[PDB]
A paper describes a structure:
The M.W. of the CHIKV-26–NTF2L complex becomes approximately 40 kDa. In addition, based on our isothermal titration calorimetry (ITC) assays, the binding affinity of CHIKV-26 with NTF2L is reduced approximately 100-fold, compared to that of CHIKV-43 with NTF2L. Meanwhile, we noticed that the binding molar ratio between CHIKV-43 and NTF2L is about 1:2, while the corresponding value is 1:1 between CHIKV-26 and NTF2L. These observations suggest that the α2 region does play a key role in the formation of the CHIKV-43–NTF2L oligomeric complex. In addition, the CHIKV-26 and NTF2L form a complex with an approximate M.W. of 40 kDa and a 1:1 molar ratio.
The interaction between CHIKV nsP3 and host G3BP1 is critical for viral replication. G3BP1 plays a key role in the assembly and dynamics of host stress granules (SGs). Old World alphaviruses, including Semliki Forest virus (SFV) and CHIKV, have also evolved ways to prevent SG formation by viral nsP3 binding to G3BP1 (24, 39, 40). The NTF2L domain of G3BP1 has been verified to bind to various partners through the FGxF (Phe–Gly–x–Phe; x: Asp, Glu, or Ser) motif.
Author numbering:
A (entry chain C): 473 to 480
B (entry chain D): 473 to 484
C (entry chain A): 0 to 117, 120 to 138
D (entry chain B): 1 to 43, 52 to 117, 120 to 138
Write the structure that this text describes.
Amino acid sequence: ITFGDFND
Amino acid sequence: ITFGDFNDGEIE
Amino acid sequence: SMVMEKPSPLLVGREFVRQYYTLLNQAPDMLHRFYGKNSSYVHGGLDSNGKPADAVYGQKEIHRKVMSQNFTNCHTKIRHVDAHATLNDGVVVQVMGLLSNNNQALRRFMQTFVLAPEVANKFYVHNDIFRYQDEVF
Amino acid sequence: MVMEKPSPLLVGREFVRQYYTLLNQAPDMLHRFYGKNSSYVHGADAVYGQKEIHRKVMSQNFTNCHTKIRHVDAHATLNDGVVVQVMGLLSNNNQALRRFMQTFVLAPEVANKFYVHNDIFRYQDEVF
């Protein structure tokens, strides 16, 4: 669902 | 380089 | 409330490829945030004497080479995604499809990723190899 | 006597050369390149380890494989392993050349000796 720097 | 399972020589 | 089984490397891989290429349509000037440092990156192209361009490394030198490729309305078609568990907790994701930049025409490409763990259950891009066919064939 | 230092793109380029030269000299020995818990994905589903890879390679009746490799990309990866992407053409049984992508992840075993842990392969022909 989420990768890297990204914030769910 | 040598790879895997082969003795130097029979690689080529 | 409901608890479901964790995604499989094949499912993790296709879902990254999905997230990746839609972002590159929506806002490619964020695409560097999939990468950490030590992150390989080449996305096609040729150099001076006609040979295939070389790689850039690290989250920041990616954000530079990503924006000189000025992406605009990237319409993309994945025909195939194949992904498997790797060394450590990683995933390698061979990808094949069709990318179109700047309303220029569709071009076939051949891509490999390596997605690596960092929370520890989050995945980042450690390597990314992309190549158009018409620049290599 | 004379001493230097090594390289990923060099290991990657070295390995390829040998992969596709043994692929023509003796496919019946292509398996010895791989270790335990390796993946062989040819075309389709995966197979694992020395014995099964050897049997899948058999079944595909590689006979007189010729290759033209057009570009090799290699980069160090996790374990100080190496990830390679190759693009080029393969022919089999004296047929005509078919454009192919192949992805190797190479992993260290012993001093200075790599083994293949993941091997995905597909042709242009039956993708786009």
